[PDB]
Tab-separated table of C-alpha atoms and ligand atoms in Angstrom:
chain	number	residue	atom	x	y	z
D	1	UNK	CA	108.955	108.139	85.115
D	2	UNK	CA	105.189	109.628	85.743
D	3	UNK	CA	103.826	108.469	89.056
D	4	UNK	CA	100.045	108.660	88.750
D	5	UNK	CA	98.797	108.854	92.354
D	6	UNK	CA	95.270	110.531	91.547
D	7	UNK	CA	92.559	108.187	92.954
D	8	UNK	CA	88.971	109.349	91.827
D	9	UNK	CA	86.770	108.946	95.155
D	10	UNK	CA	83.566	107.724	93.499
D	11	UNK	CA	80.850	106.762	96.367
D	12	UNK	CA	81.124	106.165	100.226
D	13	UNK	CA	80.518	102.484	101.017
D	14	UNK	CA	81.185	102.849	104.637
D	15	UNK	CA	80.985	105.531	107.553
D	16	UNK	CA	81.774	105.072	111.260
D	17	UNK	CA	82.962	106.890	114.341
D	18	UNK	CA	86.672	106.693	113.092
D	19	UNK	CA	86.374	107.125	109.417
D	20	UNK	CA	84.908	106.496	105.823
D	21	UNK	CA	85.539	103.907	102.971
D	22	UNK	CA	85.210	105.075	99.541
D	23	UNK	CA	84.968	103.033	96.094
D	24	UNK	CA	87.661	104.709	94.179
D	25	UNK	CA	89.293	104.384	90.798
D	26	UNK	CA	92.936	104.231	89.868
D	27	UNK	CA	94.034	103.552	86.135
D	28	UNK	CA	90.645	102.464	85.317
D	29	UNK	CA	90.461	99.829	88.408
D	30	UNK	CA	88.248	99.729	91.451
D	31	UNK	CA	90.282	100.386	94.782
D	32	UNK	CA	88.908	100.806	98.294
D	33	UNK	CA	90.027	103.883	100.166
D	34	UNK	CA	89.764	104.148	104.024
D	35	UNK	CA	89.934	107.715	105.064
D	36	UNK	CA	90.824	107.859	109.074
D	37	UNK	CA	89.380	110.397	111.532
D	38	UNK	CA	92.216	112.059	113.484
D	39	UNK	CA	90.403	110.165	116.408
D	40	UNK	CA	91.744	106.799	114.884
D	41	UNK	CA	95.115	107.663	113.640
D	42	UNK	CA	96.675	104.964	115.456
D	43	UNK	CA	94.804	102.431	113.535
D	44	UNK	CA	96.398	103.682	110.312
D	45	UNK	CA	99.653	103.809	111.956
D	46	UNK	CA	99.469	100.066	113.207
D	47	UNK	CA	98.387	98.774	110.012
D	48	UNK	CA	101.195	100.690	107.972
D	49	UNK	CA	103.777	99.650	110.451
D	50	UNK	CA	102.761	95.979	110.155
D	51	UNK	CA	102.654	96.079	106.396
D	52	UNK	CA	106.205	97.744	106.571
D	53	UNK	CA	107.209	94.675	108.616
D	54	UNK	CA	105.696	92.095	106.609
D	55	UNK	CA	104.080	92.528	103.065
D	56	UNK	CA	101.108	90.119	103.714
D	57	UNK	CA	99.732	88.394	100.568
D	58	UNK	CA	97.178	85.633	100.936
D	59	UNK	CA	93.616	85.072	99.151
D	60	UNK	CA	91.947	85.420	102.460
D	61	UNK	CA	93.578	88.748	103.690
D	62	UNK	CA	92.413	91.941	102.309
D	63	UNK	CA	94.843	92.979	99.665
D	64	UNK	CA	97.247	95.983	100.564
D	65	UNK	CA	97.782	98.558	97.834
D	66	UNK	CA	99.000	101.709	99.567
D	67	UNK	CA	99.247	103.791	102.922
D	68	UNK	CA	99.151	107.418	102.098
D	69	UNK	CA	99.926	110.424	104.373
D	70	UNK	CA	99.166	113.884	102.810
D	71	UNK	CA	100.055	117.244	104.475
D	72	UNK	CA	97.070	119.803	104.763
D	73	UNK	CA	97.049	123.387	105.992
D	74	UNK	CA	96.057	122.586	109.704
D	75	UNK	CA	95.786	118.554	109.634
D	76	UNK	CA	97.272	115.367	108.377
D	77	UNK	CA	95.059	113.277	105.905
D	78	UNK	CA	95.554	109.264	106.311
D	79	UNK	CA	94.482	106.922	103.599
D	80	UNK	CA	94.668	103.267	103.368
D	81	UNK	CA	94.205	101.746	99.984
D	82	UNK	CA	93.191	98.277	99.370
D	83	UNK	CA	91.605	95.802	97.011
D	84	UNK	CA	87.695	96.643	96.427
D	85	UNK	CA	85.156	93.754	96.901
D	86	UNK	CA	81.994	94.814	95.528
D	87	UNK	CA	79.962	92.438	97.400
D	88	UNK	CA	80.754	94.202	100.626
D	89	UNK	CA	81.142	92.583	104.223
D	90	UNK	CA	79.897	89.318	105.401
D	91	UNK	CA	77.707	91.146	107.931
D	92	UNK	CA	76.044	92.956	104.933
D	93	UNK	CA	75.792	89.773	102.622
D	94	UNK	CA	74.166	87.738	105.565
D	95	UNK	CA	71.228	89.933	105.723
D	96	UNK	CA	70.581	89.775	101.819
D	97	UNK	CA	70.955	85.924	101.581
D	98	UNK	CA	70.840	82.288	102.703
D	99	UNK	CA	73.427	79.693	102.079
D	100	UNK	CA	73.702	76.373	100.978
D	101	UNK	CA	76.091	73.627	102.658
D	102	UNK	CA	78.949	74.173	99.891
D	103	UNK	CA	78.669	77.974	100.294
D	104	UNK	CA	78.315	78.006	104.127
D	105	UNK	CA	81.569	75.781	104.349
D	106	UNK	CA	83.555	77.697	101.518
D	107	UNK	CA	82.947	80.907	103.658
D	108	UNK	CA	83.931	79.562	106.953
D	109	UNK	CA	86.891	77.531	105.812
D	110	UNK	CA	88.194	80.644	103.751
D	111	UNK	CA	87.882	82.666	106.902
D	112	UNK	CA	89.769	80.081	109.056
D	113	UNK	CA	92.295	79.829	106.133
D	114	UNK	CA	93.039	83.734	106.667
D	115	UNK	CA	93.089	83.519	110.215
D	116	UNK	CA	95.463	80.571	110.381
D	117	UNK	CA	97.807	82.661	107.999
D	118	UNK	CA	97.824	85.445	110.474
D	119	UNK	CA	98.326	83.295	113.274
D	120	UNK	CA	101.422	81.184	112.062
D	121	UNK	CA	105.025	82.296	112.072
D	122	UNK	CA	107.027	81.575	108.873
D	123	UNK	CA	110.924	81.697	109.072
D	124	UNK	CA	113.145	82.760	106.149
D	125	UNK	CA	108.530	84.576	106.056
D	126	UNK	CA	106.248	86.329	108.664
D	127	UNK	CA	105.847	87.138	112.330
D	128	UNK	CA	102.910	85.490	114.027
D	129	UNK	CA	99.967	88.046	114.117
D	130	UNK	CA	96.615	88.163	116.205
D	131	UNK	CA	93.868	90.299	114.491
D	132	UNK	CA	92.131	91.578	117.963
D	133	UNK	CA	88.791	92.657	116.164
D	134	UNK	CA	87.542	89.842	114.343
D	135	UNK	CA	83.866	90.175	113.348
D	136	UNK	CA	81.557	89.711	110.317
D	137	UNK	CA	81.900	93.528	109.498
D	138	UNK	CA	85.577	92.978	109.090
D	139	UNK	CA	85.220	90.175	106.558
D	140	UNK	CA	84.628	91.051	103.015
D	141	UNK	CA	82.868	88.561	100.568
D	142	UNK	CA	84.650	88.002	97.358
D	143	UNK	CA	83.075	87.128	93.956
D	144	UNK	CA	84.461	83.528	93.881
D	145	UNK	CA	82.438	82.695	97.214
D	146	UNK	CA	85.710	82.956	99.632
D	147	UNK	CA	85.945	85.697	102.083
D	148	UNK	CA	88.937	87.937	103.126
D	149	UNK	CA	89.772	89.248	106.613
D	150	UNK	CA	90.236	93.051	106.922
D	151	UNK	CA	91.352	95.716	109.269
D	152	UNK	CA	94.734	95.042	110.973
D	153	UNK	CA	94.503	98.450	113.029
D	154	UNK	CA	94.597	96.581	116.315
D	155	UNK	CA	96.902	93.657	115.248
D	156	UNK	CA	99.763	92.535	117.396
D	157	UNK	CA	102.979	90.880	116.177
D	158	UNK	CA	105.033	88.088	117.772
D	159	UNK	CA	91.202	101.458	120.611
D	160	UNK	CA	89.903	98.089	121.940
D	161	UNK	CA	88.202	95.156	120.175
D	162	UNK	CA	84.515	95.282	119.606
D	163	UNK	CA	82.774	94.528	123.053
D	164	UNK	CA	79.950	92.069	121.768
D	165	UNK	CA	83.051	89.941	120.469
D	166	UNK	CA	85.105	90.246	123.503
D	167	UNK	CA	86.398	86.773	124.820
D	168	UNK	CA	85.694	86.122	128.762
D	169	UNK	CA	89.346	86.873	129.563
D	170	UNK	CA	89.165	90.275	128.053
D	171	UNK	CA	85.909	91.289	129.814
D	172	UNK	CA	87.091	89.887	133.167
D	173	UNK	CA	90.595	91.489	132.573
D	174	UNK	CA	92.462	88.033	133.380
D	175	UNK	CA	93.926	87.889	129.894
D	176	UNK	CA	97.760	87.148	130.101
D	177	UNK	CA	98.852	90.421	128.280
D	178	UNK	CA	102.670	89.249	128.233
D	179	UNK	CA	101.642	85.973	126.290
D	180	UNK	CA	101.051	86.025	122.483
D	181	UNK	CA	99.045	82.706	122.540
D	182	UNK	CA	96.700	84.784	124.544
D	183	UNK	CA	95.738	87.206	121.560
D	184	UNK	CA	95.280	83.942	119.210
D	185	UNK	CA	92.660	82.536	121.711
D	186	UNK	CA	90.841	85.948	121.724
D	187	UNK	CA	90.595	85.785	117.908
D	188	UNK	CA	89.454	81.919	118.201
D	189	UNK	CA	86.495	83.137	120.546
D	190	UNK	CA	85.671	85.875	117.892
D	191	UNK	CA	85.907	83.264	115.257
D	192	UNK	CA	83.410	81.028	116.817
D	193	UNK	CA	80.807	83.835	117.165
D	194	UNK	CA	81.372	84.582	113.233
D	195	UNK	CA	80.806	80.792	112.606
D	196	UNK	CA	77.457	80.885	114.654
D	197	UNK	CA	76.301	84.161	112.665
D	198	UNK	CA	77.125	82.136	109.193
D	199	UNK	CA	75.631	78.971	110.185
D	200	UNK	CA	72.231	80.409	111.184
D	201	UNK	CA	71.857	81.549	107.418
D	202	UNK	CA	72.594	77.934	106.044
D	203	UNK	CA	69.209	76.191	104.767
D	204	UNK	CA	68.534	72.783	106.141
D	205	UNK	CA	65.151	70.889	105.715
D	206	UNK	CA	63.541	74.202	104.435
D	207	UNK	CA	64.179	75.943	107.659
D	208	UNK	CA	66.811	78.932	108.189
D	209	UNK	CA	67.353	81.617	111.144
D	210	UNK	CA	67.080	85.197	110.425
D	211	UNK	CA	70.313	87.186	110.711
D	212	UNK	CA	71.103	88.276	114.289
D	213	UNK	CA	74.478	89.545	115.885
D	214	UNK	CA	76.030	87.366	118.673
D	215	UNK	CA	74.024	87.891	121.961
D	216	UNK	CA	71.164	89.615	120.203
D	217	UNK	CA	68.914	88.084	122.741
D	218	UNK	CA	70.828	89.077	126.001
D	219	UNK	CA	72.324	92.379	125.526
D	220	UNK	CA	71.278	95.715	124.115
D	221	UNK	CA	72.598	97.538	121.030
D	222	UNK	CA	75.917	99.023	121.779
D	223	UNK	CA	76.201	96.813	124.924
D	224	UNK	CA	78.354	98.218	127.616
D	225	UNK	CA	81.504	96.202	128.778
D	226	UNK	CA	79.627	95.374	131.949
D	227	UNK	CA	76.485	94.169	129.993
D	228	UNK	CA	78.875	91.781	128.098
D	229	UNK	CA	81.024	90.975	131.235
D	230	UNK	CA	77.635	89.772	133.017
D	231	UNK	CA	76.464	87.563	130.177
D	232	UNK	CA	79.925	85.870	129.279
D	233	UNK	CA	81.789	85.874	132.467
D	234	UNK	CA	79.233	85.827	135.290
D	235	UNK	CA	76.341	83.833	133.738
D	236	UNK	CA	78.588	82.066	131.292
D	237	UNK	CA	76.009	82.221	128.446
D	238	UNK	CA	76.808	81.001	124.858
D	239	UNK	CA	74.795	81.604	121.715
D	240	UNK	CA	71.863	79.462	121.283
D	241	UNK	CA	72.142	76.257	119.012
D	242	UNK	CA	68.641	75.769	117.317
D	243	UNK	CA	67.200	72.266	117.412
D	244	UNK	CA	66.958	72.236	113.746
D	245	UNK	CA	70.783	72.099	113.308
D	246	UNK	CA	70.782	68.613	114.920
D	247	UNK	CA	68.892	67.181	111.841
D	248	UNK	CA	71.623	68.392	109.546
D	249	UNK	CA	75.225	66.631	109.406
D	250	UNK	CA	76.921	69.920	108.509
D	251	UNK	CA	75.201	72.171	111.254
D	252	UNK	CA	75.724	69.296	113.693
D	253	UNK	CA	79.635	69.321	113.011
D	254	UNK	CA	79.651	73.429	112.986
D	255	UNK	CA	77.602	73.297	116.230
D	256	UNK	CA	80.558	71.118	117.723
D	257	UNK	CA	83.147	73.250	116.395
D	258	UNK	CA	81.793	76.512	117.626
D	259	UNK	CA	81.464	75.008	121.227
D	260	UNK	CA	85.408	74.253	120.836
D	261	UNK	CA	86.092	77.872	120.072
D	262	UNK	CA	83.964	79.012	123.218
D	263	UNK	CA	85.652	77.295	126.401
D	264	UNK	CA	85.918	79.578	129.249
D	265	UNK	CA	89.535	78.363	129.557
D	266	UNK	CA	91.493	80.104	126.591
D	267	UNK	CA	93.991	77.242	126.503
D	268	UNK	CA	91.202	74.574	125.820
D	269	UNK	CA	90.106	76.371	122.553
D	270	UNK	CA	90.983	74.729	119.124
D	271	UNK	CA	93.705	76.478	117.100
D	272	UNK	CA	92.968	78.049	113.669
D	273	UNK	CA	94.938	75.076	112.143
D	274	UNK	CA	92.753	72.526	113.837
D	275	UNK	CA	89.547	74.392	112.787
D	276	UNK	CA	90.630	74.134	109.151
D	277	UNK	CA	91.436	70.461	109.335
D	278	UNK	CA	87.978	69.940	111.008
D	279	UNK	CA	86.323	72.059	108.293
D	280	UNK	CA	88.105	69.947	105.487
D	281	UNK	CA	86.521	66.697	106.938
D	282	UNK	CA	82.935	68.016	106.874
D	283	UNK	CA	80.839	66.974	103.998
A	1	LIG	C1	103.922	107.473	95.605
A	1	LIG	O1	102.511	107.412	95.796
A	1	LIG	C2	101.782	106.475	94.997
A	1	LIG	C3	102.471	105.789	93.881
A	1	LIG	C4	101.742	105.012	93.084
A	1	LIG	C5	102.486	104.349	92.038
A	1	LIG	C6	102.099	105.033	90.727
A	1	LIG	N1	102.951	104.587	89.539
A	1	LIG	C7	103.989	103.955	89.733
A	1	LIG	C8	104.395	103.451	90.770
A	1	LIG	C9	105.710	102.603	90.790
A	1	LIG	C10	105.936	101.476	91.374
A	1	LIG	C11	107.249	100.906	91.356
A	1	LIG	C12	108.160	101.347	90.866
A	1	LIG	C13	109.518	100.765	90.974
A	1	LIG	C14	109.871	100.143	89.636
A	1	LIG	C15	111.142	99.125	90.048
A	1	LIG	N2	112.312	99.958	90.489
A	1	LIG	C16	113.458	99.053	90.858
A	1	LIG	C17	112.003	100.751	91.664
A	1	LIG	C18	110.675	101.500	91.594
A	1	LIG	C19	107.991	102.744	90.428
A	1	LIG	C20	106.800	103.247	90.270
A	1	LIG	C21	103.791	103.576	92.164
A	1	LIG	C22	104.158	103.128	93.387
A	1	LIG	C23	100.246	104.723	93.154
A	1	LIG	C24	99.715	105.524	94.344
A	1	LIG	O2	98.337	105.029	94.635
A	1	LIG	C25	97.764	103.960	93.996
A	1	LIG	C26	100.521	106.160	94.991
A	1	LIG	O3	99.721	106.842	96.211
A	1	LIG	C27	99.474	105.846	97.256
A	2	LIG	C1	101.007	99.913	94.404
A	2	LIG	O1	99.981	99.369	93.485
A	2	LIG	C2	100.240	99.127	92.192
A	2	LIG	C3	101.385	99.303	91.458
A	2	LIG	C4	101.718	99.164	90.207
A	2	LIG	C5	103.057	99.365	89.470
A	2	LIG	C6	103.243	100.513	88.764
A	2	LIG	N1	104.374	100.679	88.129
A	2	LIG	C7	105.474	99.893	88.358
A	2	LIG	C8	105.369	98.744	89.188
A	2	LIG	C9	106.622	97.755	89.200
A	2	LIG	C10	107.402	97.550	88.297
A	2	LIG	C11	108.379	96.703	88.423
A	2	LIG	C12	108.951	96.390	89.776
A	2	LIG	C13	110.089	95.627	89.751
A	2	LIG	C14	110.771	95.425	90.881
A	2	LIG	C15	112.142	94.655	90.931
A	2	LIG	N2	112.287	94.160	89.605
A	2	LIG	C16	113.089	95.062	88.793
A	2	LIG	C17	111.307	93.402	89.079
A	2	LIG	C18	109.834	94.217	89.218
A	2	LIG	C19	108.095	96.698	90.817
A	2	LIG	C20	106.799	97.342	90.801
A	2	LIG	C21	103.981	98.460	89.889
A	2	LIG	C22	103.875	97.276	90.635
A	2	LIG	C23	100.662	98.689	89.398
A	2	LIG	C24	99.444	98.245	90.092
A	2	LIG	O2	98.327	97.742	89.421
A	2	LIG	C25	98.537	97.285	88.015
A	2	LIG	C26	99.298	98.527	91.415
A	2	LIG	O3	98.183	98.217	92.012
A	2	LIG	C27	97.037	99.070	92.204
A	3	LIG	C1	86.134	96.486	106.828
A	3	LIG	O1	87.311	97.240	106.696
A	3	LIG	C2	87.529	97.670	105.543
A	3	LIG	C3	86.796	97.296	104.296
A	3	LIG	C4	86.988	97.680	103.140
A	3	LIG	C5	86.195	97.506	101.863
A	3	LIG	C6	86.729	96.910	100.901
A	3	LIG	N1	85.928	96.524	99.745
A	3	LIG	C7	84.688	96.709	99.716
A	3	LIG	C8	84.006	97.306	100.825
A	3	LIG	C9	82.533	97.586	100.721
A	3	LIG	C10	81.921	97.810	99.559
A	3	LIG	C11	80.473	97.993	99.231
A	3	LIG	C12	79.730	97.792	100.437
A	3	LIG	C13	78.226	97.868	100.581
A	3	LIG	C14	77.845	99.140	100.581
A	3	LIG	C15	77.346	99.611	99.017
A	3	LIG	N2	76.204	98.820	98.376
A	3	LIG	C16	76.428	98.685	96.888
A	3	LIG	C17	76.224	97.426	98.966
A	3	LIG	C18	77.769	96.968	99.402
A	3	LIG	C19	80.353	97.439	101.905
A	3	LIG	C20	81.647	97.184	101.893
A	3	LIG	C21	84.648	97.723	101.834
A	3	LIG	C22	84.081	98.417	102.972
A	3	LIG	C23	88.251	98.552	102.944
A	3	LIG	C24	88.870	98.745	103.939
A	3	LIG	O2	90.190	99.604	103.794
A	3	LIG	C25	90.467	100.329	102.615
A	3	LIG	C26	88.684	98.356	105.327
A	3	LIG	O3	89.466	98.769	106.274
A	3	LIG	C27	90.704	98.091	106.470
């Protein structure tokens, strides 16, 4: 048997503190290759350990292809190979485009579907999984208008999360770290912020909000842990719901849903399954 392992790295589509993502080519087909910095080796090990435990396969989860470790003269090279989504991240997409009602709902219900799949334990199956870094940059847009969730480098099975998206109990260090349900409730908080980011870009009555990240109006770029703690925990601020949403039945329902992801009390927040059911009854 010939085992063709050569991947041609064609163009860099992402670079950050902790590595690069490349569009690559295997056997005439696009793949995405994440090349890890030595600084973020544990994200490669955690995602690899998870996929070695359960081969996740879901339309709303970025599709796994391979984990590769290659010996170099003085270092180890770590690659994660996945499906390639040419339309890029939701974060990217929402700057380039406004949404109609159908596309808005298809995006958010697809994200909820992916997240409920991660969260649910299946017997016979998969362990329950919490993501721990859900945000619009870790969601990819597919050609069919659904999204998929990426980056299980911080996932837990039953590095810290992006500070802008941290739930109040992470910022005030009251999270029950010995309780798996705590980590689901942190993802639900983050989901509510993503829902807000998407809903802003849905047109109603000729009106749309510009793309902004959550808390854009109350914290700096690269907010500190303390910046976020004072907004979210001490002052208990939440993202603004513009008046124009209350003229639109879809955005009225989505505002109620995002409120039920943002309760200070983590156990009051909706579950991913309840969010899907609610979204299927909207419109
Ligand atoms: C090692 O490394 C890489 C390998 C590959 C790759 C290339 N051709 C063929 C294969 C293949 C798959 C499966 C079998 C099975 C057949 C059924 N039998 C009962 C057991 C064995 C054999 C061969 C693979 C896995 C691609 C890669 O990159 C995309 C690799 O690098 C990450
Ligand atoms: C890693 O990823 C890719 C891999 C391959 C690929 C290459 N050679 C062989 C295979 C294979 C053949 C046969 C079995 C057997 C296993 C048990 N039983 C006997 C029935 C089925 C398994 C595996 C595959 C899956 C192709 C891909 O794309 C077309 C891959 O995606 C990039
Ligand atoms: C978040 O996390 C991961 C994401 C990916 C991933 C998968 N498909 C497509 C992409 C992508 C492509 C293209 C753009 C832009 C830039 C170029 N311009 C043309 C506009 C579009 C953005 C993004 C990525 C970044 C893979 C990963 O691992 C292999 C990730 O990590 C787990």
